[PDB]
Ligand binder design. Structure first.
Ligand SMILES: Nc1nc2c(ncn2[C@@H]2O[C@H](COP(=O)(O)OP(=O)(O)O)[C@@H](O)[C@H]2O)c(=O)[nH]1
Ligand SMILES: O=S(=O)(Nc1nc2c(O)ccc(Cl)c2s1)c1ccc(O)cc1
Ligand SMILES: [Mg+2]
Length: 170
């Protein structure tokens, strides 16, 4: 009695993809994690009464032209699209990652959660209302997280599981 969920964490370099993933799996915050390391992590959790096996790919390179990226986007069932709340460019990059994924899936039905990470940093450049508006325009949830303090880290990933589970019924 288990259900598998293949999750992929994407976003511009430095937004906290690794820090989020390592906080979820290993309960620590990494100060400086090599940006080229691309690994997957598996963990079993209970979400809404279901024992879930999360298989999470923490992506490194975000290149448009990458056979490996095409392959993991085909494999991945849901996508955590991460920007940093103190980096406007990373928020603008989100549109491109969504377009890449939609292209690979040939579909509009893609389970995705918009994550504004680094919520513990006081000098915000991305207004929460703008991020909420973007998420509304895509029809996806929006969550602000802090990999540093663990704020909403499990919530971001579990929310993505819920999105996948629902899309499976549609
Ligand atoms: N203050 C703060 N720093 C963070 C947070 N998440 C990541 N960082 C830092 O931002 C930098 C990049 O994080 P990393 O996880 O390596 O980014 P990635 O390239 O997206 O994997 C590192 O110095 C992290 O310690 C966060 O929620 N808050
Ligand atoms: O496509 S893979 O051969 N394996 C994958 N593993 C996982 C995985 O463990 C979770 C989610 C996804 Cl989408 C994938 S894709 C691969 C993906 C990226 C690599 O750097 C190396 C291998
Ligand atoms: Mg990383």
């Amino acid at each position: 009695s288990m259900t598998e969920y293949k999750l992929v964490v994407v976003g511009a370099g430095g937004v906290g993809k690794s820090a989020l993933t390592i906080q979820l799996i290993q309960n620590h915050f990494v100060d400086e994690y090599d940006p080229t390391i691309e690994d997957s992590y598996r963990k079993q959790v209970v979400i809404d009464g279901e024992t879930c096996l999360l298989d999470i790919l923490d992506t490194a390179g975000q290149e448009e032209y990458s056979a490996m990226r095409d392959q993991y986007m085909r494999t991945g069932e849901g996508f955590l699209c991460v920007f940093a709340i103190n980096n406007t460019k990373s928020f603008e990059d989100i549109h491109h990652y969504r377009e890449q994924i939609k292209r690979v899936k040939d579909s509009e039905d893609v389970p995705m959660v918009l994550v504004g990470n680094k919520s513990d940093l006081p000098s915000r450049t991305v207004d929460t209302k703008q991020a909420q508006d973007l998420a509304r325009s895509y029809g996806i949830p929006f969550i602000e997280t802090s990999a540093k303090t663990r704020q909403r880290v499990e919530d971001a990933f579990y929310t993505l599981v819920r999105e996948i589970r629902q899309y499976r019924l549609k």
